[PDB]
Amino acid sequence: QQEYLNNNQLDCDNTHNSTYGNVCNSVTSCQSYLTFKSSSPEYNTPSSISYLLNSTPSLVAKSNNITDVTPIITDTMVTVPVTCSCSGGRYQHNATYNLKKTGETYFSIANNTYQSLTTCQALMAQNPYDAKNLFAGDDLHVPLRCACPTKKQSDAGFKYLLTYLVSQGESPDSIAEIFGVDTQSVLDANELDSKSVVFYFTPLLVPLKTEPPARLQI
Numbered sequence: 001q002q003e004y005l006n007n008n009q010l011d012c013d014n015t016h017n018s019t020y021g022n023v024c025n026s027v028t029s030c031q032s033y034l035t036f037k038s039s040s041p042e043y044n045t046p047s048s049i050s051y052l053l054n055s056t057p058s059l060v061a062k063s064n065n066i067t068d069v070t071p072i073i074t075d076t077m078v079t080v081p082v083t084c085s086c087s088g089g090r091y092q093h094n095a096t097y098n099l100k101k102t103g104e105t106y107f108s109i110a111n112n113t114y115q116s117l118t119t120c121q122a123l124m125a126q127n128p129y130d131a132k133n134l135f136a137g138d139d140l141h142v143p144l145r146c147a148c149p150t151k152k153q154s155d156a157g158f159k160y161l162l163t164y165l166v167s168q169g170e171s172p173d174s175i176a177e178i179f180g181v182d183t184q185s186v187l188d189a190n191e192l193d194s195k196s197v198v199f200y201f202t203p204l205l206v207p208l209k210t211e212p213p214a215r216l217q218i
């Protein structure tokens with residue numbers, strides 16, 4: 001279980017503990033997954049998506065049953081295998097991001113470029129630049145959100161946790177059905193209950209019993 005981000009990442013001045021990352025509460029390192037929506041023309045191949053998220057093109061290709069050079073149709077949600085590890089008391093998967101345009105902000109990088117796979121708060125905490133001193137060509141340390149199954153989750157049969165970018169219309173019920181797991185396992189993984197509002201566009205942890213399906217929309 002990890003705290004649910006609960007839209008606290010939408011205000012860069014918000015200081016809720018969840019915004020600085022999942023908490024290191026299990027094994028120091030594990031295999032994990034992110035999700036990411038293909039974006040044309042910059043992030044729509046295994047090469048460019050892996051470059052943004054620090055995976056490998058072969059891992060992205062195999063995870064989605066495509067080749068490592070296959071163009072991915074815009075808005076397709078793909079799975080991205082990554083190593084999740086503990087750093088500074090948090091679980092995260094490191095990536096590096098070079099700003100392309102002077103005008104990009106900590107928030108635009110977290111919310112738009114990385115599709116809320118990281119937060120403004122974690123970016124600011126792990127980079128030296130002032131929010132008013134970012135220029136094209138600056139490299140950012142990007143702490144992508146992932147977690148490793150706790151002992152209790154492992155004992156329940158979950159081999160991985162997957163960081164799931166919730167889309168319009170989706171619910172814990174419908175997301176659990178994609179991965180063939182119980183709705184209650186999804187709720188428990190995020191410390192939610194059936195009355196909790198699950199926000200669109202905010203990452204949600206999904207515990208997995210096996211590797212994710214190659215196509216999420218099936």
Ligand SMILES: *[C@@H]1O[C@H](CO)[C@@H](O[C@@H]2O[C@H](CO)[C@@H](O[C@@H]3O[C@H](CO)[C@@H](O)[C@H](O)[C@@H]3O)[C@H](O)[C@H]2NC(C)=O)[C@H](O)[C@H]1NC(C)=O
Pocket residue numbers: 085087088094126141
């Ligand atoms: C992902 O990124 C984090 C930082 O966000 C890396 O954490 C780093 O952890 C190492 C290991 O303790 C720290 O190294 C220490 O640093 C000093 C030099 O500053 C040196 O005396 C020693 O080598 C000492 O171990 C390091 O401080 C820390 N980095 C930061 C920026 O705080 C982590 O290793 C990264 N993980 C992966 C898998 O890339």
Ligand SMILES: *[C@@H]1O[C@H](CO)[C@@H](O[C@@H]2O[C@H](CO)[C@@H](O)[C@H](O)[C@H]2NC(C)=O)[C@H](O)[C@H]1NC(C)=O
Pocket residue numbers: 111112115201
């Ligand atoms: C942060 O990102 C989200 C996308 O995850 C943006 O949400 C959009 O909101 C507008 C209305 O303001 C909708 O028309 C779009 O459909 C939403 N996006 C998606 C992908 O569905 C949001 O605008 C971003 N916030 C900022 C301040 O840039």
Ligand SMILES: *[C@@H]1O[C@H](CO)[C@@H](O)[C@H](O)[C@H]1NC(C)=O
Pocket residue numbers: 017023089
């Ligand atoms: C936030 O969490 C950290 C460790 O995850 C802890 O040291 C700190 O006390 C927490 N802060 C609050 C306000 O609960």
Ligand SMILES: *[C@@H]1O[C@H](CO)[C@@H](O)[C@H](O)[C@H]1NC(C)=O
Pocket residue numbers: 065214215
């Ligand atoms: C991969 O794609 C092939 C051909 O489209 C399909 O028959 C096969 O079942 C897929 N494999 C997996 C593991 O999804």
